[PDB]
């Protein structure tokens, strides 16, 4: 019988630079009248910086607007911001995914069974992980094959990439580097190697 239809006025995918301001805004039609409007992030509720009002004062109005002001975004403030609204009949939600530019972060690096090496990087944009082998006596060029795989917080608002190689092919004592980079920066984990 009743309904709520949320229309985003800005793209529900948001890319921003560290320190940027952005407004998450929606217009929605609801009947009967909405209630318990709230913006949620990390399962917590904004008690400020947000506004929610009817599009018109006409007594037959059913269009509403709600806006969340996000200011000076830090790299750690990306993630899913959800708008929840309900009336005496229906629940509706809409998720905005905010991604803030940050250099890759190496979350784990491991020695696997069967001689494989693995490092896991998170960041935005999506980190590219290159592997380099450096003998005792410059290094190599990024090596293949590689098992790359997109994992699915913390950290929130980041694309997480798992990259694995087989160290078996490599010969001689040295150091293996897994470099995670993107347009923002780069980072590296190192494995010491014995033959």
């Amino acid at each position: 019988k009743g309904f709520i239809n949320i229309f985003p006025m800005i793209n529900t995918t948001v890319f921003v630079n560290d320190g940027e301001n952005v407004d998450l805004i929606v217009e929605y039609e609801a009947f009967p009248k909405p209630e318990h409007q709230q913006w949620i992030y990390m399962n917590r509720t904004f008690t400020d910086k947000w506004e929610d009002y009817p599009k018109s004062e006409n007594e037959s109005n059913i269009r509403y607007v709600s806006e969340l002001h996000l200011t000076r975004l830090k790299g750690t403030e990306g993630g899913t911001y959800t708008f929840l609204v309900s009336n005496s009949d229906v629940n509706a939600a809409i998720a905005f995914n905010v991604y803030v530019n940050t250099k890759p972060e190496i979350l784990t690096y491991d020695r696997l069974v069967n001689g494989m090496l693995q490092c896991v990087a998170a960041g935005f944009p999506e980190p590219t992980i290159d592997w380099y082998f450096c003998p005792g006596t410059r290094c190599s060029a990024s090596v293949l094959p590689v098992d790359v795989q997109t994992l699915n917080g913390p950290p929130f608002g980041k694309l997480v990439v798992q990259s694995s190689i087989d160290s078996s092919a490599f010969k001689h004592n040295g150091t293996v580097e897994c470099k995670a980079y993107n347009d923002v920066g780069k980072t590296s984990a190192y494995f010491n190697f014995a033959f």
Partner: antibody
Amino acid sequence: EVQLVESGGGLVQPGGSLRLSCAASGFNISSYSMHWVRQAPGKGLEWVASIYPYSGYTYYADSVKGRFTISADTSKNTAYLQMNSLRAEDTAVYYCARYVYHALDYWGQGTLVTVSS
Amino acid sequence: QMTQSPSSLSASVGDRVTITCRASQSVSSAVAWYQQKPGKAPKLLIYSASSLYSGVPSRFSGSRSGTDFTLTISSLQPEDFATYYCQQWAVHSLITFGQGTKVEIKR
């Protein structure tokens, strides 16, 4: 860095028609609202119109309502103001600006629209 | 509706100037202030009444009367010559600009 560049302005005959464009770089207009603001020679700022490029929603001042049309191309990252039935009183510098937190934080350098015979 | 004052003023270098803005009764916080140098696009100084926009020097601040919004420039600088605008956002009237206040630097 962020950059806004208006273009397509110039001398236009009373009743004539003109179309301004605003090319944005350094941000996605579909994550914001874009506005046109005009300033008549030696006068103050006057809000003209706005648009949410993602949804296509548009808004107009009464003085231009039904006579101007604001639009946007999310792939070219460019907003437009189509001006019709131009008059001497519409003569001004037109700026495009990015809207966030109720203010206009980034502005173009402006383009002069002169309405004259 | 919206009203700004004074329309024009003259101040010395090192002075402290205060520009008042009378916004609609419905608007509670949505007030911004711009600076416009001659032949240039306006620059955002303050938003949401008291928030200082990045890159803008501390000389500028936004405050209250209260009930009326105020722009304040302390230690006025020779480069502070310009026209200053307040602007409001309100639900039914959307974006409205103030008449402007031209600041001449007494010398």
